Design a protein around this ligand. Structure first.
Ligand SMILES: COc1ccc(C2(C(=O)N3CCC[C@@H]3C(=O)Nc3cccc4[nH]ncc34)CCCC2)cc1
Ligand SMILES: [Zn+2]
Ligand SMILES: [Zn+2]
Ligand SMILES: [Zn+2]
Length: 441
């Protein structure tokens, strides 16, 4: 081999199909049918009977194969078209679409005074936006002030933007929508953006984020609000000593930008994802740990405190204090975001109380206050006389980046891990190719 290392891809984590939020981890015993419907051992033996509803066809348990999630797929090699030398495709970052003529190794390149043809499928050449330019300018200006020899050029690209609506769930709908007290749905625009760092002339995707933006056309209570759906990272930014600062620069810049457009309030649900290796990026580095809730909360506070000192954020409060200042009385006054905690808990509260949308509201808000940040961007008289929000950036149709599920599925299907610098660089290269090609159609 090339680098003298025997390399294989790790067994991934699978869903178990007989419980929402159930997964089959690596090396665990499980049952599968047609390599499509997998069941963890516990969920399988708990099914009363030997019949399993799937899809809705009923399948017998003897048709299932008993397996352990221990399959190690070896890494692929590519062969130099001149040396015959076999090298890991990931080590040399050879992509057939980028260099269709074939793989020529570095040694054969030097022995002809030759360089690889320019990678036109780069992060920088992804279409720009006013938002992405604003963010990457902030990050790169910050990095240049640090004068650290290891920092590379950072690219920020918005890769998806589409119109969506969040639907009020049945319990809140029956309580408040059917009475005409609350809009049935709330229109918003979702945006997905990613940050890339050039390391040794090679792109590395190290940050990703999806947001929901509710414009001046949105009925209350969601008007002029932005909400972070999810944020994720791969911890290989160089230098490490500027990693946290760069994340904060992106988030503060996003808040600064939406404030300029006229959004008044930002919302953050500071809740770590469940333990696992996939959130936005597939197969995180094993030594990158998910922060515990208190540390994640302090991390967001540190970011927002800097935003306050920069006069970008006027102030921020937890949901409980914010409700108290706003003199809230009913759950219909709480902003209603897609996939957020509050729509789910309000369904429970109405059911538990026998049909009230106010009973446990303040107690529930106090119980979870430290997890929910309400960020005031525009305050005072200015927040009441604002012009309509007009976004100069166009819609970006990209089904791979409409939500986080599609990109995870592509990475799983093509072994695109972010578990090491070399694999993350390869997964970044493949991800950029997909983004450049899907758009060309
Ligand atoms: C205080 O410590 C912190 C605070 C914030 C972060 C950020 C960050 O990446 N995260 C906040 C929670 C989600 C994501 C994260 O840690 N994801 C994962 C890491 C490892 C394995 C994983 N599996 N699944 C997801 C996942 C970094 C930028 C955005 C916030 C990281 C550490
Ligand atoms: Zn190698
Ligand atoms: Zn299960
Ligand atoms: Zn060669």
């Amino acid at each position: 081999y090339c680098c003298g290392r025997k390399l294989e891809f790790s067994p991934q984590t699978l869903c178990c199909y007989g419980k929402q939020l159930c997964t089959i981890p690596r090396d665990a015993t499980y049952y599968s049918y047609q390599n499509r419907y997998h069941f963890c051992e516990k969920c399988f033996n708990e099914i009363q009977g030997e019949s399993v509803s799937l899809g809705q066809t009923t399948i017998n348990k003897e048709q299932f194969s008993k397996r352990k999630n221990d399959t190690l797929d070896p890494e692929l090699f590519v062969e130099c078209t001149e040396c015959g030398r076999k090298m890991h495709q990931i080590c040399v970052l050879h992509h057939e679409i980028i260099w269709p003529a074939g793989f020529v190794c570095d040694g054969c390149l030097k022995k002809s005074a030759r360089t690889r043809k320019e990678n036109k499928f780069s992060a920088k050449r992804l279409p720009s936006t006013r938002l992405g330019t604003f963010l990457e300018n902030r990050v790169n200006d910050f990095l240049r002030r640090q004068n650290h020899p290891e920092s590379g050029e950072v690219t920020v690209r918005v890769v998806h933007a589409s119109d969506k609506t969040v639907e009020v769930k049945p319990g809140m709908k029956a309580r408040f929508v059917d009475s005409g007290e609350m809009a049935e749905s709330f229109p918003y625009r979702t945006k997905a953006l990613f940050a890339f760092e050039e390391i040794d002339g090679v792109d590395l995707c190290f940050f990703g984020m999806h947001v929901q933006e509710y414009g001046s056309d949105c009925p209350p209570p969601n008007q002029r609000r932005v909400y972070i759906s999810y944020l994720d990272s791969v911890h290989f930014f160089r230098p490490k000593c500027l990693r946290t600062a760069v994340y904060h620069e992106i988030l503060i810049g996003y808040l600064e930008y939406v404030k300029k457009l006229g959004y008044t309030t930002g919302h953050i649900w500071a809740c770590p994802p469940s333990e696992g290796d996939d959130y936005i990026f597939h197969c995180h580095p094993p030594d990158q740990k998910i922060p515990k809730p208190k540390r994640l909360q302090e991390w967001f506070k540190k970011m927002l405190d800097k935003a306050v000192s920069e006069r970008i954020v006027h102030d921020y409060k937890d949901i409980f204090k914010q409700a108290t200042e706003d003199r809230l009385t009913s759950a219909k006054e709480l902003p209603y975001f897609e996939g957020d905690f509050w729509p789910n808990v309000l369904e429970e509260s109405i059911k538990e109380s026998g049909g009230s949308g106010s009973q446990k509201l303040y107690a529930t808000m106090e119980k979870h206050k430290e997890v929910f940040f309400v960020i005031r961007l525009i305050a005072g008289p200015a927040a009441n006389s604002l012009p309509p929000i007009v976004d100069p950036d166009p819609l970006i149709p990209c089904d791979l980046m409409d939500g986080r599920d599609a990109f995870l599925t592509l990475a799983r299907d093509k072994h695109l891990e972010f578990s090491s610098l070399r694999r993350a660089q390869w997964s970044t290269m493949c991800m950029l190719v997909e983004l450049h090609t899907q758009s060309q159609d």
